Amino acid sequence: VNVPKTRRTFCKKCGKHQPHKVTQYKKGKDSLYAQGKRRYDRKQSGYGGQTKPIFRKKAKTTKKIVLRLECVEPNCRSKRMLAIKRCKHFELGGDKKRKGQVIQF
Amino acid sequence: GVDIRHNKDRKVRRKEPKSQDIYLRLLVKLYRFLARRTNSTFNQVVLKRLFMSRTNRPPLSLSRMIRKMKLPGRENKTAVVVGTITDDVRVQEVPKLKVCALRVTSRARSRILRAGGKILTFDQLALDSPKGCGTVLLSGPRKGREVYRHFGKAPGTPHSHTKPYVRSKGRKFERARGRRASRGYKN
Amino acid sequence: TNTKGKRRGTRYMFSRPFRKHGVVPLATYMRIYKKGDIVDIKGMGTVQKGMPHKCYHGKTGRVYNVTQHAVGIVVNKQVKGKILAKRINVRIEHIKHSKSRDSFLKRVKENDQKKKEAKEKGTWVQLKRQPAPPREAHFVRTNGKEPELLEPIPYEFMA
Amino acid sequence: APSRNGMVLKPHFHKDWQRRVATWFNQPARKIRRRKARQAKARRIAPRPASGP
RNA sequence: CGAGGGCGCACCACCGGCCCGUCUCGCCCGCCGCGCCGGGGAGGUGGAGCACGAGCGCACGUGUUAGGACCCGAAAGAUGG
RNA sequence: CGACCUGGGUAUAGGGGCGAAAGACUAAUCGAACCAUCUAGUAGCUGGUUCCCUCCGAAGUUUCCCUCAGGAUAGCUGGC
RNA sequence: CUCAACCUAUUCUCAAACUUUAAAUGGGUAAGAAGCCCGGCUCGCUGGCGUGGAGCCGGGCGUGGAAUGCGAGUGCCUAGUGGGCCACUUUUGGUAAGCAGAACUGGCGCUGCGGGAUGAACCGAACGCCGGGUUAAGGCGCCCGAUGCCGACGCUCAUCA
RNA sequence: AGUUUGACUGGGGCGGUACACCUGUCAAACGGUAACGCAGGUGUCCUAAGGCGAGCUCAGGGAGGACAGAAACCUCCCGUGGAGCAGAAGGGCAAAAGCUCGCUUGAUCUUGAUUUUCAGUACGAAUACAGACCGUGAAAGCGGGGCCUCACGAUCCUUCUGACCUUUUGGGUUUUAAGCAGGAGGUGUCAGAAAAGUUACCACAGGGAUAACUGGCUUGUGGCGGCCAAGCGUUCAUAGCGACGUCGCUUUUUGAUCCUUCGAUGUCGGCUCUUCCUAUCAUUGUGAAGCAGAAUUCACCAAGCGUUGGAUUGUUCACCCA
RNA sequence: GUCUACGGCCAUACCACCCUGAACGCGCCCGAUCUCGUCUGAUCUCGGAAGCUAAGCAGGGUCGGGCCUGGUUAGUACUUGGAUGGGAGACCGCCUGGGAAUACCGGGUGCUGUAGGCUU
Ligand SMILES: [Mg+2]
Ligand SMILES: [Mg+2]
Ligand SMILES: [Mg+2]
Ligand SMILES: [Mg+2]
Ligand SMILES: [Mg+2]
Ligand SMILES: [Mg+2]
Ligand SMILES: [Mg+2]
Ligand SMILES: [Mg+2]
Ligand SMILES: [Mg+2]
Ligand SMILES: [Mg+2]
Ligand SMILES: [Mg+2]
Ligand SMILES: [Mg+2]
Ligand SMILES: [Mg+2]
Ligand SMILES: [Mg+2]
Ligand SMILES: [Mg+2]
Ligand SMILES: [Mg+2]
Ligand SMILES: [Mg+2]
Ligand SMILES: [Mg+2]
Ligand SMILES: [Mg+2]
Ligand SMILES: [Mg+2]
Ligand SMILES: [Mg+2]
Ligand SMILES: [Mg+2]
Ligand SMILES: [Mg+2]
Ligand SMILES: [Mg+2]
Ligand SMILES: [Mg+2]
Ligand SMILES: [Mg+2]
Ligand SMILES: [Mg+2]
Ligand SMILES: [Mg+2]
Ligand SMILES: [Mg+2]
Ligand SMILES: [Mg+2]
Ligand SMILES: [Mg+2]
Ligand SMILES: [Mg+2]
Ligand SMILES: [Zn+2]
C-alpha cells in the first residue's frame, strides 16, 4: 500500500481536524527494568534451564502496519497510533499512480 | 394402553409442615378445621402458609408492617403475618397496631405494646375472627435473600447482573478477563 | 462442513424476480411504519445495506423502533427447542406491511360498527366467524333433461 | 471437574497434612492443669495479688 | 348470595429516582490557606449496588472438590543398603 | 601340551562391575540385580461394587477442548 | 453445377453445481379488553401549521369477536448420558454389501405379550393380581386351539410342482 | 540427565487437510443438515481500487474513411448489459455500483444496542443509531473503508500513544517503576503446550471401538453359462464357432467391508486319511457331426469306479520326463 | 377530447413500419454579447422568436413480434397420508386428499394522482 506522509484527521487534544505528519511506528527497545523482564531474569537465573515457552512456530508472514500521526500544530504535538490492515509491501509517501499512461516497454 | 404421560401426575406441594413443632402442629389442626368447615379463603391461605418452609416465610420488619397498615382504609384492621415480626430500628414512631404473628421479636414486641398495640397468636386470631374478617394478610419480602443475587442468568453472559460465587472480594478476584475490554473482552 | 457465510444458500433467495431488476420503486420508501405494526421481512438483494439474515426471510415481526432508514423488528426465531424473540435492524427496502393485521383491524371496525347498529336498532347478529357448515338440503332440477351417461374409455397406447 | 455454578475452591491439602494434625482431646485436661497451677501459685504468694504485678 | 366499587401482600413486567467509575456539555458556589484549591449541575454509559434490612449459629440431606478418597491393579521414578 | 582343565585365597558392586562382544554374566532374576522405604505412587483404561416395595424416568445430540476410549457446555431426567 | 461456414424458419435429445413458469407437503404472523372509540395534558424530539410522533391523564364501550382439546405460570438444586443401531420414505459415495454417510417419523436400546416355526427392530398390541365376554394381527388337515361349511367360481400336473 | 516427538483417518503408516475460513451444489421450495461428497477459492490487494459530486456508456456487430491489411485511429447505426466492478463463485448494478474527471481523507474521535457462529460465551465480520469533528455537493443528502457474502487471533509479557491523571509504603522534591485507556509484536493444531527419532532386546494398561488368518454380506475382478446372430466355416448364421450388445450363475481368485474373535480359535506347504460336489478326463448306455473306417469333436442320463511314477523348487502354482 | 409540469404502479405502457394531428402547449429552430462549457455554441450554458410539424411527442393502424390475461394441455405430470397391494426386480396400480408447465387456440394493447392550460 501507499499512504501519504501527511493527512488531515481528528486530533483529540485540539478536539478538531488538524494536519498530521505520518510516519511508520517501530517497536522500541526493551527496558530490562520492566517488571516482566525483571521477573523473567530472576526466574531464569540459577539452574532449571528455560523456564518460559519459546514460540518458534511462526505462521504469519506480514504485520499490521502502524502509522504514528503527529499533530503539526506547534503547541499540540499530540501523537496517535492508527493500525491499517496487513500488507506485504508498505510505502510511505511514494509516487502516486496515473491512469492514461504507457507501461514501460 | 392409554396415550397419556405420567410425569406430572404427582403435584409437588406441602400437604403438612415438615416441622415437628407440636405447637405449630396444634394450630395447623385448628386451621385445617377452619379451612375445611368455613368458606373463607383467608383460612386456606393461612393454612397453606403454616405448611411452608422458613425461606418461604420471610420475616416482616416493623417498618414494612407499619407502611402497609398505613394505607387508606386499613385502620382498625388486624395485620396477620405467618412468620416472625422483626423490629426495625430505622423507624422512630410506632403507631397503635393490632397484629397476629407466629413469632414476634422481643424488642419488636416491647415497641408494639408501648405504642398501645395488641399482639395475638394464631389461636387468638381464630377466636377473634374465625373467617378472617377485617384483616390485612401481609408477607415479608420473599426474594430478600442473598441466594437470589446469585440466581438468574450466568454471570459470564451479556446483560446479566447476577452475583458470582467468590471466596473473597477484591481487585484480584474475578475482575480481569471477561470483565473489562482491556483484558480480552467484557460482555 | 457447511460454511458459516452470512449469505450461503441465498442464491435465489436474494435474487430479483425475472424482469424486475433495476431501480427500486419509490413507494417502498414512502411507506409509513410506526411502533407496533406487523411487517413481513422480505430481503431484496438490490440493496446490500440493512439486509436481514437469511433466517428472517419470510418471517413476520412487530416494529418497536424507527430510525432514518431502518426499523427495529421483534421477530420470533426458533432455535432447537426454544423460540426466542430476536430484535433486528432492517432497512425499509426489506420489509412491507403485513395484510393479515390489516384484515383483522378491518374486521374489528366492522364488528364494532355492527354492534353499534344492532344495539341502536334492536337486533342481535352473529359476529364470530364460523367454520364452513355442512351443506343445506336443496332440490336439483333436471329441467326435463336426463343426466348424461358416463362410461370409462377404452385403453389405447397414446404415443 | 467443575459442575455448574460454584466457587473456585483452593484447598491446601496437597502437602501430606495427615501426618501433622493437632487434635484437642487434651484441651479439658490442659484447662485443669493450668487452673491447678494458677491455684498453686496463688497459695505460694500468700497475701500478694494472685494475678501478678 | 351478590353486579359493581375500594385499599392492595408477596412476586413479575415496565417507567422514573439515588450511590460509585468513566465520558460529553455547561454555568455557578465556598474561603484561615485564593489555589495547577474544594464543591455542585444536565445528558449517556460501566457496577457482583440503594430504593424501610435477613442475617448469624446449629443440625440434617444432596451435589462438586482436595486428601489413599468406592475397592483392587501397572510398565516406571527416587532414597538408603 | 595348551589362548588347556580345576580347588582354595583375593580384587572389581548396580547406570556400576566384568565381557576373545552373545546386550553376555553379575546367587534359577539382567536392554540396568536384590532388599526395605518414599508408596495405599498415578491410571481418561479393565474387573467388581452387598436388603425389599412404590413413584418418576433418559442419552448416545449442540458448541469448545493436543479433543476422537475423556471432559466442560446446552439438551433430555428426577427431586423440592 | 457442387460442398463448407454464415443467416433464417423448423426438427431430435438433455442439465446436482441451468431456467421463463411452477406444485404437494412445508415455514412465519393474525384471529381483541394490553382491544376499540372519545376528549384532554407533557415534550428539550420533529416542524409552514394546535405539524408529526411518542408518552401520560380521564371517560364510554363485553355479542369475551374461528373450531377442538387441556388447568396454567414460575424458581432452585440435580444425576445419568455425550460409542448407538434398525425400518417406511427421501437421499450421497460405491458394481454392490447384513457397506459408509445424511433428512423425517417411529422403534430397539430400556420392552414383556399375541402372530411371523425360529429371530433385538416386521405385523398387532404395550404390561398391577385375577374371573367372564370380545377382538387385533394371524390363522382353522394332523402336530396345534379353531372350517368335521354337503362353502362359491375358475386356474394348474411339475421324472428339481 | 530430564523430557517431548499433534490430530483426523473405511486399521495404522505413506499420501491428503475434509484442523480456521469463503462460493455454488448436495439439501428433499423456511432455516438447519453428514462423508478422505462434487466444482472451486483464502492467509492477500488498494491514497485509491476509500468518500462525495458531475459528465458519460459498456461487450459485440453492421456500414464507411490515405497509407491501414483479419487486428492501429476517425464517423454513423444497432446494442438489457451478452462488458466492467482487484481476486473464487453466487447475488446485485446502466444519465448504476461500470468509465473519465474535480475536490478530498468518514480508512478519523467516542458510548452503548443489535445481527451473524452461538452455549444465545468470545473473537472476527456486519447492521441501525446517538454525540463530536470533517469531506463533498447548488442542495436534498451521502460518507465513519472497499457493492454484498471471506481475507484472521485470548491470558501473561513486551512496545508505543493519552490524561499539567493515580500509586511509588514516615513526610517532601526529582529520576525510576507500577497502574488506568487505546493500538501493535501471535499463537495457521487458527478458543491460542515450548518439542526429533528408533526398538526384532522391548514393557504395561487395554482394545475385537481397530488390521493380519477362518467364517458372514457383496461379486467389481476371476471362473462358468445363456439370449440375439454380423460374420468364420470351398458354399451354408447356428456340425463346430460367435463380433457388436445384453441376461445370469458360482464363491476353488483377488478385492470391498470390519459383524464375531486381541483375560489367544496355533498362522504356509507337504505327508497321512475319510467323506462330499459336479461345471464328466476315462469307463457304462446314448443322441449329433463338415461321423466311410480308425481317430476326433459337441451334447444327454450319469459322480458307481478310477485319475499314477519322477527331475527342479519350501512352495501352492509352474514346467518337463515317462 | 386532449396537452404541459411533477409523479404512483413500472411493457395492457416495449419494439418495427405506416397514417393523422385543430387550439394551447411541448419541441424542432435562430444566435454567441453576457453566465458557462467545449478539439468543435454538436452537447451543456446563456440571449431569443423568422420558419416548421419533417422529426421528437400524442392518437390510430398491422390476420405484426413481445407483453398481460384466459382456454386447452389436464384431473395429465407431480404429490400428503395408507395397505401382510402387484411385481424377481425396475417400477406400477388402488385408497385418501392437493394439483401443475410447454406446444396449440382466444381476448386485450396502459390505468391513474396533484397543479395548470387549450378545445363556440
Ligand atoms: Mg412410566
Ligand atoms: Mg428502572
Ligand atoms: Mg453443585
Ligand atoms: Mg485405592
Ligand atoms: Mg521421570
Ligand atoms: Mg543385537
Ligand atoms: Mg499400587
Ligand atoms: Mg470400554
Ligand atoms: Mg448405515
Ligand atoms: Mg447400553
Ligand atoms: Mg422409552
Ligand atoms: Mg415392545
Ligand atoms: Mg412371538
Ligand atoms: Mg419364517
Ligand atoms: Mg381373558
Ligand atoms: Mg399355525
Ligand atoms: Mg384341533
Ligand atoms: Mg420353477
Ligand atoms: Mg426442506
Ligand atoms: Mg432449505
Ligand atoms: Mg453519477
Ligand atoms: Mg455521525
Ligand atoms: Mg458498504
Ligand atoms: Mg481449535
Ligand atoms: Mg461364409
Ligand atoms: Mg468388529
Ligand atoms: Mg460400522
Ligand atoms: Mg487354545
Ligand atoms: Mg483348537
Ligand atoms: Mg451333469
Ligand atoms: Mg400479437
Ligand atoms: Mg393420488
Ligand atoms: Zn493537535
Q: Are C79 and C20 in contact (CB under 8 A)?
A: no
The integer distance in angstroms from the CA atom of C34 to the C1' atom of I89 is 64
Q: What distances in angstroms separate CA C51 from CA B72, B178, C39, one per listed residue? A: 56, 31, 15
What are the b/e assignments for D15-48, b being 16+ CB within 10 Å? Answer: eeeeeeeeeeeeeeeeeeeeeeeeeeeeeeeeee
Q: Mapping DSSP to helix (H, G, I), strand (E, B) and coil, where does residue A80 land? A: strand
Q: Are B108 and B62 in contact (CB under 8 A)?
A: yes
Report how far residue B107's alpha carbon sits from residue B61's, in angstroms, rounded to the nearest whole number: 12
Query: Which backbone phi and psi does A83 adopt, to 5 degrees?
Result: -100, 135
Q: Which residue is listed with cell 417502498?
A: C28
User: Residue B5 CB closer than 7 angstroms to strand F?
Assistant: yes
Query: Which backbone phi and psi does C119 adopt, to 5 degrees?
Result: -70, -45
Query: Which backbone phi and psi does B135 adopt, to 5 degrees?
Result: -125, 150
Q: Cβ atoms within 10 A of the Cβ of B103, count?
A: 14
Cell readout for B110 is 416491647
Instruction: Specify the DSSP class assigned to residue A39.
Output: H
Q: What is the CA angle D11-D14-D18, rounded to 5? A: 100
Q: Are A77 and A71 in contact (CB under 8 A)?
A: yes
Which of these, C43, C45, C40, lies nearest to C22 by C-alpha position? C45
Q: Kindly calculate the radius of gyration of chain B based on its CA atoms and give it in whole angstroms.
A: 22
- Longest C-alpha distance within chain D, in Å? 68
> Based on the number of CB atoms within 10 Å of its own CB, is B183 exposed (0-12), middle (13-18) or buried (19 or more)?
exposed
Q: Are B134 and B77 in contact (CB under 8 A)?
A: yes
User: Residue C106 CB closer than 7 angstroms to strand G?
Assistant: no
Report how far residue C148's alpha carbon sits from residue D10's, in angstroms, rounded to the nearest whole number: 95
Q: Are C45 and C93 in contact (CB under 8 A)?
A: no
Q: What is the CA angle B178-B180-B182, rounded to 5? A: 110
What residue type is A3 in one-letter code? V
Which of these, C105, C101, C97, C100, lies nearest to C40 by C-alpha position? C97
Instruction: Specify the DSSP class assigned to residue D41.
Output: H
Instruction: Specify the DSSP class assigned to residue A65.
Output: E
Q: What distances in angstroms separate CA A102 from CA A2, A96, A98, one per listed residue? A: 21, 15, 10
Q: What distances in angstroms separate CA A66 from CA A22, A63, A85, one per listed residue? A: 10, 9, 9
Report how far residue B157's alpha carbon sits from residue C82's, in angstroms, rounded to the nearest whole number: 18
Instruction: Specify the DSSP class assigned to residue C3.
Output: -
Cell readout for C116 is 353499534
Which of these, B122, B121, B119, lies nearest to B47 by C-alpha position? B122
Which of these, A67, A75, A68, A69, lies nearest to A14 by C-alpha position? A75
Q: Are C52 and C94 in contact (CB under 8 A)?
A: yes
Residue A77 CB contacts under 8 Å (≥ 6 apart), including other chains: A70, A71
Q: Which residues of B touch D5 (CB under 8 A)?
A: 150, 154, 165
Q: After which residues is chain C broken (C to N over 2.5 A)?
A: none
Q: Mapping DSSP to helix (H, G, I), strand (E, B) and coil, where does residue C31 land? A: coil
Q: What distances in angstroms separate CA D24 from CA C18, C24, D34, D38, one per listed residue? A: 92, 89, 15, 21
Q: What distances in angstroms separate CA C108 from CA C34, C55, C113, C131, one per listed residue? A: 20, 32, 8, 18
For the four alpha carbons of B121, B123, B128 and B131, in that order, the dihedral sign comes to: positive
Task: Give the closest nucleotide to A95 (alpha carbon vs C1').
Answer: H47
What residue type is A89 in one-letter code? H
Which of these, C28, C41, C32, C31, lies nearest to C87 by C-alpha position? C41
Which residue approaches H184 most closely, CA to C1'? A66
Which residue approaches H89 most closely, CA to C1'? C11
Q: Mapping DSSP to helix (H, G, I), strand (E, B) and coil, where does residue C52 land? A: coil
Report how far residue C87's alpha carbon sits from residue B6's, in angstroms, rounded to the nearest whole number: 38
Instruction: Quickly list DSSP for chain B.
Output: ------TTSS----SS-S---HHHHHHHHHHHHHHHHS--HHHHHHHHHHHS-STTS--EEHHHHHHHHSSTT-TT-EEEEEEEEE--TT-------EEEEEEE-HHHHHHHHHTT-EEE-HHHHHHH-TT-TTEEEE---TT-STHHHH-SS-TTSTT--PPP--SS-STTSS-STTTSTTSS---
Q: Which residue is listed with cell 452470512?
A: C6
What is the number of alpha carbons within 13 Å of residue B11 lying toward its C-beta? 3
Q: Mapping DSSP to helix (H, G, I), strand (E, B) and coil, where does residue A11 land? A: strand
Which residues of chain D are at the B interface, by a Cβ-Cβ cutoff of 8 Å?
5-9
Which of these, C19, C34, C5, lies nearest to C95 by C-alpha position? C34
Distance from CA of D17 to the nearest CA of B (A): 22
Method of elucidation: cryo-EM
> Based on the number of CB atoms within 10 Å of its own CB, is C73 exposed (0-12), middle (13-18) or buried (19 or more)?
buried
What are the b/e assignments for C22-35, b being 16+ CB within 10 Å? Answer: eeeeeeeeeeebee
Cell readout for D45 is 504468694
Helix or strand holding residue C101 (H, E): helix C99-121
Q: Are C40 and C60 in contact (CB under 8 A)?
A: yes
Report how far residue B24's alpha carbon sits from residue A80's, in angstroms, rounded to the nearest whole number: 74
Distance from CA of D37 to the nearest CA of B (A): 43
Report how far residue C48's alpha carbon sits from residue C27's, in angstroms, rounded to the nearest whole number: 19
What is the number of alpha carbons within 13 Å of residue B107 lying toward its C-beta? 7
- B167, D6: Cβ pair inside 8 Å? no
Report how far residue A49's alpha carbon sits from residue A70's, in angstroms, rounded to the nearest whole number: 44
Report how far residue B94's alpha carbon sits from residue B92's, in angstroms, rounded to the nearest whole number: 7
Q: Which residue is listed with cell 491439602?
A: D13
Cell readout for A10 is 481528528
For the four alpha carbons of C9, C13, C18 and C22, in that order, the dihedral sign comes to: negative
Q: Mapping DSSP to helix (H, G, I), strand (E, B) and coil, where does residue C103 land? A: helix
Q: Which residues of B touch D8 (CB under 8 A)?
A: 166-167
> Based on the number of CB atoms within 10 Å of its own CB, is B31 exposed (0-12), middle (13-18) or buried (19 or more)?
buried
Q: Which residues of D touch B165 (CB under 8 A)?
A: 5-7
Which of these, B173, B176, B181, B179, lies nearest to B157 by C-alpha position? B179
Q: Mapping DSSP to helix (H, G, I), strand (E, B) and coil, where does residue C76 land? A: strand
- What was the resolution (in A) of this experimentally determined structure? 2.6
